[model samples]
Target chain A: VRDAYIAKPHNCVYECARNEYCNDLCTKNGAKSGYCQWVGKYGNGCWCIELPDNVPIRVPGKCH
Target chain B: VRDAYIAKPHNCVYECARNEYCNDLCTKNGAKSGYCQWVGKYGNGCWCIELPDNVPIRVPGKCH
Candidate 1:
């Protein structure tokens, strides 16, 4: 589902400064990661990608 | 941001079996890790906690 999403570097500071995603509580260079976000506990060390409007989603069925 | 959450281990297999969170794409003892969930990529290197919400979210403002 990746379309025009930016690649998140998974860094607490980077995520925050860049507004990519907070890696809170996540460990980075011996420091605490950023604040918790929606996805899950760990947002750091990962990419928070956004997809283009026309992107094809393979995950069938929506969760109600 | 936890509501009825569990302490997830940074283990891929464990996360999957427990359904705590998929540590997919995360490195575990030289393994490739689990599939990506609603969260980010490094699920293996972290926990997927479910917290009790009464959870006071104090963001400066809401996004439109």
Candidate 2:
């Protein structure tokens, strides 16, 4: 099934300044695509689609 | 940092019929909140916010 995950380099997902960056990260990790999700309780985050087995699951925590 | 993950009960995330269902699943799993994401390559999915360490990372796969 289609799966979603927080994009890596924790900082990247936290800041999520640009969609392009998230796109690269997701594609590199085997996701079909990714984008910066704005308007959330935690601000911006890199949202990836269809991520693969190697990537770690996203978890909640305070930003650094 | 704020993390995102695919909501559990894999089938639930795949169908993602109602926002309330996703919200309950996310909050129960340590996420602040969740919603049904309707527009995506893989159809509907339960997108969760601020998931905790206990939740496993989301990955891509064919729906059963």
Candidate 3:
């Protein structure tokens, strides 16, 4: 969650290259809907999973 | 998840009013941390619950 929330543009780009899905919703700071992602019901967040190439990458927080 | 994730100030006001427990993460945002929250094994998520307002509100992502 934190990694996604405050992650800089360069960081996001780097991470995206690593995997499209970070297993949570995240956004760059100072953007609308840019709050941190709560990975679980208890709100802890998620684990890192390799991005799937076949699925559509839904950038929920991005200005789509 | 998106509402809980990207809720602006006013939106949060309405939600927090209905229930405080919210059966989810205890945090704010920024200064993110390792997402130690994958609820179920497959990690879909959790249903919302009433905020106890009694137990200590442990804010993991809120610098607690």
Candidate 4:
């Protein structure tokens, strides 16, 4: 069974003003589905579920 | 503004037989909300949103 993981695209936060926008972005990027994290660490960005392996996953933390 | 970060508790996968179990676990652990990732990398575990700073975050990937 494939484990469900959380991820965002590389160098892309998928910032959005609405949930619909995120929904489109996620589907286009090969996610099962996505929603807008309106008040998240990345701030109003799309969060993808079951994101494809082909899409790069974003690291969670500051890069020095 | 606090960034929306993903995390699970220390040494805890919050494994659940059902979504309700995960929902209870998340609230008790100081998360605004949580849901069961029925088929995730960790397999049938709770994923918390807005988890408290008091709780430790899980590191992704393999540990040697």
Candidate 5:
């Protein structure tokens, strides 16, 4: 089974600028793959995908 | 009416510094409220909540 987790904001804008780069890097970091996206001010974010693990992602908040 | 959309990023990191501000500004733009999130290379992003109609968000991609 696959699980989803948004990685912490990256410090390198250029690095998170491309989806392909996110795929490669996140997979290397143990994700099945990743999506590069702009979540805050602009483009430069990654959502990593992989199997579940022990570390519970700490994302907190609610929207409606 | 309530819909979910990620707003086009603001250039000011400081402007997006507060979630409450994003909520206020996006509601003014026709949202119920907004959440400040770091989606890209770093901090500074907005996810607006409100009704949906025109101006389809252009985000594209999939991960697994």
Candidate 6:
């Protein structure tokens, strides 16, 4: 099993038209799963799962 | 599977003595699980797993 972490270095919000799109991105990013989060604040940003201690997380300047 | 959401209203950081303690709190709060997030920032605040559409999450003030 993958070790769980609240967030990851590659973790950041991004815009996607479909749920599958976000999940696909997260999967590619090596996450078990991903979905839409911060929908209200970031206007639908993607969030994903990652291991507990990945260095240099992906904190984007803007989630658009 | 549970619908996922990020952040919550009651979701505030607390001085947790152990990981199990935090997980207990989150489980009692009706979440599937909880763990310390923003470890360096909030000094070990609790993050939890919840349904994506659970209105008005626990966004605790000053995760101290």
Name the best candidate (by lDDT): 2
lDDT of 2 at A7: 34
Tens-digit lDDT track of model 2 for A1-64: 2455553334223234457656765675678998766765445556777877667645576322
**Highest DockQ among the candidates is held by which one?**
1
The CAPRI classification for model 5 reads as: incorrect
Error of 1 at A60 (Å): 2.5
Ranking by TM-score: 2, 4, 5, 6, 1, 3
RMSD for all candidates, in order, please. Answer: 15.3, 15.5, 15.1, 15.5, 13.6, 15.5
For candidate 3, the lDDT comes to 0.25
The ten-residue window of minimal lDDT in model 5 chain A covers: A6-15
- Across B1-64, the per-residue lDDT of candidate 5 in tens digits comes to 4544443322222113446645754565677777665564334445577635553332443322
CA lDDT of each candidate?
0.26, 0.57, 0.25, 0.52, 0.47, 0.45
Better of 1 and 6 by DockQ: 1
Model 5: runs farther than 4 Å from truth? Answer: A1-64, B1-5, B9-15, B39-43, B55-58, B61-64
Better of 1 and 2 by TM-score: 2
In each prediction, how many residue pairs overlap at the backbone (N, C-alpha, C within less than 3 A)? 16, 2, 4, 8, 12, 13
lDDT of 6 at B11: 46
**TM-score of every candidate relative to the true structure:** 0.18, 0.39, 0.17, 0.38, 0.33, 0.31
Q: What TM-score does chain A reach in every model?
A: 0.18, 0.64, 0.19, 0.65, 0.48, 0.51
What CAPRI class is candidate 4?
incorrect
Model 5 lDDT per residue over A1-64, tens place: 2444443332222224446655664575676777765564333345567734642332444222
lDDT of 4 by residue, A1-64 (tens): 1112234323435333445545655666678787767666655456777777767644566321
Error of 3 at B17 (Å): 30
Better of 1 and 5 by TM-score: 5
For B1-64, candidate 4 gives per-residue lDDT tens digits of 1112234323424333345545665666678777766666644456777777766554565311
DockQ of each: 0.05, 0.03, 0.02, 0.02, 0.03, 0.02
Cα error of candidate 6 at position A42, Å: 3.6
Query: Model 6 TM-score?
Result: 0.31
lDDT of 5: 0.47
Candidate 3, residues B25-60, lDDT tens digits: the string is 323232121122224321222222333333232222
